[PDB]
């Protein structure tokens, strides 16, 4: 019975290792995407802020 429990524990460990590898790669990809979207949203917010400030200045000067 010792061999049965030993092999069961080894199989559980291997399955845990495989799941670890898969979800760790997925989490790394998620982090890459989150960094990319952070950069994109920062650029977009800065650009829209600049554009709206310029528009406000132009309309105030014209009016």
């Amino acid at each position: 019975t010792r061999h049965s429990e030993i092999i069961k524990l080894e199989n559980s460990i291997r399955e845990l290792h495989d799941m670890f590898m898969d979800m760790a790669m997925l989490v790394e990809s998620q982090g890459e995407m989150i960094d990319r979207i952070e950069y994109n949203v920062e650029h977009a917010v800065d650009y829209v802020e600049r554009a709206v400030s310029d528009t406000k200045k132009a309309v105030k000067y014209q009016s």
């Binding site: 019975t1 010792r2 049965s4 429990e5 524990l9 559980s12 399955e15 845990l16 799941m19 979800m23 997925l26 989490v27 990809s29 998620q30 995407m33 989150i34 990319r36 979207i37 994109n40 949203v41 650029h43 977009a44 650009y47 829209v48 554009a51 528009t55």
Partner: protein
């Protein structure tokens, strides 16, 4: 000669007991580590949902503003080769560990139930974000079309 071999066997048994104790301690620590990881993953998932909802609201508001602007116009563990009471406790420890690892496996599955899905959702919003940027850029270009 033989006494030295017996002493070596006793030292090996002591090392085995120390290894079992270290195994038990390590698994006990790993249980708390996994619980903390699970709660942190749940918090991150809720935060991701809160980001997705915010970005959807951003898209809706931008579309509404653009439209308005356009329309404005177990069996044994240790052999009793050396007898001794220690073996007994050893058995129990491994048995306990067995149960624990089983439980641990379940926890792993739990995390998965969320993780993968979240990633997919993120991708979608990312695409939308890019489109949104282009749209506003286009709007800016359109805003400059009349100015000439």
């Amino acid at each position: 000669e033989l006494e030295e071999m017996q002493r070596r066997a006793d030292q090996l048994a002591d090392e085995s007991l120390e290894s079992t104790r270290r195994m038990l301690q390590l698994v006990e620590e790993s249980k708390d580590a996994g619980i903390r990881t699970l709660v942190m993953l749940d918090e991150q998932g809720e935060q991701l949902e809160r980001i997705e909802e915010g970005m959807d609201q951003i898209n809706k508001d931008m579309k509404e503003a653009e439209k308005n602007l356009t329309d404005l116009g177990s069996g044994g563990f240790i052999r009793r080769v050396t007898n001794d009471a220690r073996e007994n406790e050893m058995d129990e420890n491994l048995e306990q560990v067995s149960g624990i690892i089983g439980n641990l496996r379940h926890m792993a599955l739990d995390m998965g139930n969320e993780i993968d899905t979240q990633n997919r959702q993120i991708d979608r919003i990312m695409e939308k974000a890019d489109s949104n940027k282009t749209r506003i850029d286009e709007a800016n270009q359109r805003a400059t079309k009349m100015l000439g």
